[PDB]
XYZ file of N, CA, C and O in Angstrom:
100
model
N -11.500 38.137 -73.535
C -10.183 38.902 -73.533
C -9.510 38.612 -74.379
O -9.418 37.255 -74.686
N -8.590 39.564 -75.137
C -8.001 39.252 -76.116
C -6.226 38.697 -75.616
O -5.780 39.856 -74.898
N -5.681 37.678 -75.656
C -4.186 37.155 -75.257
C -3.234 38.135 -75.650
O -3.259 38.434 -76.926
N -2.657 38.570 -74.776
C -1.588 39.809 -75.087
C -0.629 38.790 -75.933
O 0.159 37.960 -75.637
N -0.029 39.851 -76.852
C 1.156 39.469 -77.852
C 2.240 40.207 -77.244
O 2.372 40.986 -76.917
N 3.482 39.528 -77.588
C 4.693 40.265 -77.480
C 5.200 41.278 -78.344
O 6.473 41.410 -78.560
N 4.076 41.822 -79.081
C 4.492 42.420 -80.088
C 4.214 44.252 -79.559
O 4.568 45.230 -80.325
N 3.499 44.189 -78.403
C 3.284 45.574 -78.088
C 4.298 45.912 -77.055
O 4.135 45.387 -75.332
N 5.344 46.544 -76.910
C 6.333 46.993 -76.020
C 6.803 48.262 -76.786
O 7.790 48.635 -76.791
N 6.022 49.347 -77.129
C 6.316 50.408 -78.084
C 5.516 51.845 -77.869
O 4.207 51.291 -77.499
N 6.005 52.754 -77.772
C 5.218 53.715 -77.685
C 4.057 54.115 -78.619
O 3.100 54.782 -78.754
N 4.054 53.311 -79.808
C 2.957 53.226 -80.751
C 1.732 52.647 -80.358
O 0.506 52.993 -80.920
N 1.697 52.147 -78.986
C 0.602 51.650 -78.478
C -0.563 52.934 -77.815
O -1.529 52.916 -77.305
N 0.289 53.884 -77.555
C 0.055 55.119 -76.489
C -0.766 54.694 -75.355
O -1.608 55.193 -74.994
N 0.335 53.721 -74.716
C -0.113 53.359 -73.463
C -1.627 52.984 -72.903
O -2.244 53.165 -72.167
N -1.869 52.000 -74.117
C -3.130 51.532 -74.294
C -3.246 50.221 -73.430
O -2.265 49.778 -73.141
N -4.286 49.294 -74.004
C -4.713 48.137 -72.829
C -3.795 46.929 -74.329
O -4.031 47.278 -75.270
N -3.493 45.970 -73.733
C -2.979 44.828 -74.669
C -4.308 44.460 -75.591
O -4.107 44.380 -76.740
N -5.235 44.323 -75.050
C -6.525 44.232 -76.027
C -6.993 45.047 -76.866
O -7.293 45.191 -77.816
N -5.987 46.409 -76.383
C -6.685 47.313 -77.128
C -5.524 47.774 -78.038
O -5.954 48.390 -79.394
N -4.769 47.149 -77.938
C -3.183 47.303 -78.961
C -3.187 46.108 -79.753
O -2.553 46.264 -81.054
N -3.414 45.233 -79.128
C -2.986 43.863 -79.890
C -4.468 43.031 -80.516
O -4.773 41.652 -81.169
N -5.605 43.846 -80.237
C -7.095 43.234 -80.583
C -7.685 44.277 -80.885
O -8.718 44.666 -80.016
N -7.492 45.116 -81.996
C -8.398 46.222 -82.136
C -9.712 46.001 -82.802
O -10.040 45.383 -83.881
N -10.621 46.449 -81.855
C -11.778 46.135 -82.501
C -12.923 47.589 -82.166
O -12.659 48.269 -83.540
């Protein structure tokens, strides 16, 4: 799993998971 970053606290992730917004593959 990709460790959650304190960068995702914004509607820009579209309510994704941490690994999906902070670890896009």
